[PDB]
């Protein structure tokens, strides 16, 4: 019979799990020191950072960087209950075409539910054992005005945490970080590194600016100390981690004999690039496949690879795939015409625009991306890929076109993708079936798309989305006009051969 995941059942779980299960054999509890305090224990932390730490503990005997997880909101009580009932063990389920495999993760050693005791969280962060405070709080948790690049200090949440009456009861990430750092300053300790693991560009620089700005509104002396002695490394993170369903839980018990209140499902691939900026020490991340780099310029190089080849290929699969009648990313990627289209867009048009990175083979990366896209267990819905395209195409596809214009390099397939979005905006696929177009600019986009025919001039006139270099290039206009005409007349599948070889 299946067994509840916990310390006392771990050995029998391993004994009955065959080659389908692996378990931590390092010691836990009092045997480790919690060098990492993680704010926002969710799926991505439990599939990415926590797994690197697990491998450092298991394969290399690192004993002082176990994780104390923190949940900030009442909603997080379910995570507290799941981990507490399992002695903070949980199962990572890796799924691919090869099948599914269970990896019990033991790197989270304890959990602090902030609404139960906010002082405990501050004191934990302030404790000398804490070397790193890591974050997965999503973009909205940064209280970041992207237009002005400033802290939203007028936000009621920030005003509350800034009130000295609340200095012992912060509620935001920055309130907790500041309260912890002020106590470290009092104790003569170094600032802990603040290590943002959210998937956003300049995650470290944004975190630094927000906390510095917060601290400046409290005590400028502490703020200067944070600025000068603190560490806020920028990083690139990549690992697909879908939400767990109730069926994932019952499937785990049925196949692997593990009863887990909240397992985590993920893909085999994982990547972590992080610049070497740490204020209170770090474990040897490089030993478990982490790419530790020099500075933010080095991180930006990896981020450009991912933006143009991963997200750019998602665009190639998404809008053409929706028009063609597909439902899932893995269906589009398995189609032979799309396989050649995407690979040749990657190789002929995107790759020449990319910086070479020591130890990185772009052709290997391209093949890995296609393999990940083909993974049928991800069940990545094309409507989710295509959602809010006005914020995606100008970031993933148009920059490659613009840089191709600067050197008169190849961009026919890139233009095809942009033209496929333009046709997609009308909301009718190649079989005559409507689909929803979801976009913060949906009304304007559908207005312009109707004004223009099979012609892109009206859409390209939106000055907030497209620059003058696009409208003033004759080869681009001629190329996207042609693609948009052929897609409208013959559809995606019939037009793809004109872009292969």
From Swiss-Prot:
Protein's UniProt keywords contain NAD: yes
EC number: 1.1.1.67
GO biological process, one term: mannitol metabolic process
Reactions catalysed, as given in the entry: D-mannitol + NAD(+) = D-fructose + NADH + H(+)
InterPro entries recorded: 6-PGluconate_DH-like_C_sf, 6PGD_dom2, Mannitol_DH, Mannitol_DH/Oxidoreductase, Mannitol_DH_C, Mannitol_DH_N, NAD(P)-bd_dom_sf
The organism's place on the tree of life at top rank: Eukaryota
Protein family per UniProt: Belongs to the mannitol dehydrogenase family.
Alphabetically ordered keywords of this record: NAD, NADP, Oxidoreductase
PANTHER family: MANNITOL DEHYDROGENASE 2-RELATED (PTHR43362:SF1), MANNITOL DEHYDROGENASE DSF1-RELATED (PTHR43362)
Residues the entry annotates as binding NAD(+): 36-47
Function: Catalyzes the NAD(H)-dependent interconversion of D-fructose and D-mannitol in the mannitol metabolic pathway. Has a preference for NADH over NADPH.
Subunit structure: Monomer.
Pfam families to which the protein is assigned, alphabetical: Mannitol_dh (PF01232), Mannitol_dh_C (PF08125)
Keyword Oxidoreductase attributed: yes
Gene Ontology molecular functions: mannitol 2-dehydrogenase activity; mannitol dehydrogenase activity; NAD binding; NADP binding
Name of the protein this chain belongs to: Mannitol 2-dehydrogenase
